[PDB]
Design a protein around this ligand. Structure first.
Ligand code: CA
Ligand code: CA
Ligand code: CA
Ligand code: CA
Ligand code: CA
Ligand code: CA
Ligand code: CA
Ligand code: CA
Ligand code: CA
Lengths: 488, 32
């Protein structure tokens, strides 16, 4: 590694070391920030002057207002300190973090030249610095574009402020690309402590439980039961309230248990919550649905299919039953062109081409064929029809059957975008559709949350993190934010 | 990092850094 590469890796490693001690590996908590400051920048925080120093520092660095310091905020802080130190050394004529900052300063000064009383890089100096310290980063004159991109004041040079801003940007890009020891007994002890603390320490409960995998939460529940002789979920049900309770109790169930309880809740009592039933049944895969069927009958002493049959009717019932069987053809990864064309033509003949609809044909095709096959089928279907599959569904059917078909085609085409749209709908208006938001954040945090976030940011222009921040507050908000995993 | 540069494709946080207003006076106070 080059000296500059080594310094960047050192800054990343410092952040990683301190961010992993509690909560998320992606941010620093206030306590983590105080520890980092004491060990890596001793004396900068003048604690002893005031014991509130870290609160002020956190407020100063917390650009997005979530009471944590992610890597973007941390790296802009490190760059500001390094630039100030460069100017201080200029005007005047060791921990790991301090070492990395000093290394960046030394690297700049080893390629820089005198200009006025400052040290700057011309284009050629910048060229050689890039080729020797960041090999592979650099068009015939890509160094000129790099110069113009960094030259903020437009004086045809790169001073240290512009350089350190560039270094911060590329270190941040490396960390985010990397984004894109566990012990159950210790977790259980700390959770019991947080539960028995007067008033309940919900912050610790969230910090731990929303930053473990489902399997690790099962381990923690077993360790808690063995330590306490009481069930973790009952203790937390007693200790918590409201939406935070909903979130935590959902996280404590296995994926299949959670989906099964949500389906039962969608059918238990008068009427039906068709939106929830449709979301779960159309979005879940073969393996997920088979596990749901087993666990559902375990938990409720009846078949999920029998509950669906009892709660629904007509073609909507037919579609839901067929989908809930969870025996769609698996991705064969061998393309059946003849069947793609025949399925497309059948879908057209059954719907837009004729008066009425051959709904059983639609159901057979869209529940039995594999997902890649059906993606190709929808593209081919367009060749026959002036309306794509979704608009065809809107023109052909209505009510719960139409809703089910629309959701199903969306999950076949782009399931992350489906969930991004559902989340946006759950938050966009007044109040929150907390049931939907919680169910999606809990059920997809470990599945495709990165892709959901990417589609959400692409379509709506701000992050899923941001919308959660605006719609929810308190420990509930912080739990949902940890389940999202990061801003953008 | 050599091969990672092709993998990435990243904005410049110049205003965020300026807003912190860290000056050599701060570093002087820190260095005692
Ligand atoms: Ca953390
Ligand atoms: Ca923050
Ligand atoms: Ca300049
Ligand atoms: Ca409390
Ligand atoms: Ca309660
Ligand atoms: Ca019912
Ligand atoms: Ca209903
Ligand atoms: Ca028709
Ligand atoms: Ca709202």
């Amino acid at each position: 590694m080059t000296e500059l590469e080594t310094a960047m890796g050192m800054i990343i490693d410092v952040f990683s070391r301190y961010s992993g001690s509690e909560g998320s590996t992606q941010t620093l908590t206030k306590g983590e920030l105080k520890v980092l400051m004491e060990k890596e920048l001793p004396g900068f925080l003048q604690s002893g002057k005031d014991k509130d120093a870290v609160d002020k520092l956190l407020k100063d660095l917390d650009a997005n207002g979530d009471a944590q310091v992610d890597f973007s905020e941390f790296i802009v802080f490190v760059a500001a300190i390094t630039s100030a130190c460069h100017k201080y050394f200029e005007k005047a004529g060791m921990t790991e973090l301090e070492t990395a900052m000093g290394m960046i300063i030394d690297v700049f000064s080893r390629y820089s030249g005198s200009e006025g009383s400052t040290q700057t890089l011309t284009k050629g100096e910048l060229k050689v610095l890039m080729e020797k310290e960041l090999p592979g980063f650099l068009d015939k004159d890509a160094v000129d574009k790099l110069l113009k991109d960094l030259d903020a004041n437009g004086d045809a040079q790169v001073d240290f402020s512009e350089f350190i801003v560039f270094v911060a940007a590329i270190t941040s890009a490396c960390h985010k690309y990397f984004e894109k020891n566990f012990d159950a007994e210790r977790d259980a002890l700390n959770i019991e402590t947080a539960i028995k603390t007067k008033g309940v320490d919900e912050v610790t409960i969230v910090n731990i439980l929303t930053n473990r995998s489902n399997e690790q939460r099962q381990d923690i529940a077993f360790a808690y039961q063995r330590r306490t002789k009481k069930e973790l979920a009952s203790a937390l049900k007693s200790a918590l309230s409201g939406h935070l309770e909903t979130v935590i109790l959902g996280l404590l169930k296995t994926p299949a248990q959670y989906d099964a309880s949500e389906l039962k809740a969608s059918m238990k009592g008068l009427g039906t919550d068709e939106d929830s039933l449709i979301e779960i049944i159309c979005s879940r895969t073969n393996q997920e649905l088979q596990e749901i069927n087993r666990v559902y009958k375990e938990m409720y002493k009846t078949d999920l299919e029998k509950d669906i049959i009892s709660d629904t009717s007509g073609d909507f019932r037919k579609l839901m039953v067929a989908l809930a069987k969870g025996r769609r053809a698996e991705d064969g990864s061998v393309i059946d062109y003849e069947l793609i064309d025949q399925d497309a033509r059948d879908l057209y003949d059954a719907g837009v081409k004729r008066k009425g609809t051959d709904v059983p044909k639609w159901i057979s095709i869209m529940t039995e064929r594999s997902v890649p096959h059906l993606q190709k089928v929808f593209d081919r279907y367009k060749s026959y029809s002036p309306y794509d599959m979704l608009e065809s569904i809107r023109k052909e059917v209505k009510g719960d059957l139409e809703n089910a078909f629309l959701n199903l085609v969306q999950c076949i085409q782009n399931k992350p975008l489906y969930f991004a749209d559902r989340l946006y709908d759950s938050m966009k208006g007044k109040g929150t559709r907390d049931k939907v938001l919680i169910r999606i954040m809990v059920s997809r945090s470990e599945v495709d949350m990165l892709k959901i976030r990417s589609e959400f940011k692409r379509k709506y222009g701000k992050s899923l993190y941001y919308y959660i921040q605006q719609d929810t507050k308190g420990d509930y908000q912080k739990a949902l934010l940890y389940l999202c995993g990061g801003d953008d | 990092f050599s091969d990672l540069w092709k993998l990435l494709p990243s904005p410049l946080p110049s205003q965020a850094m300026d807003d912190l207003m860290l000056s050599p006076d701060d570093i002087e106070q820190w260095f005692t």
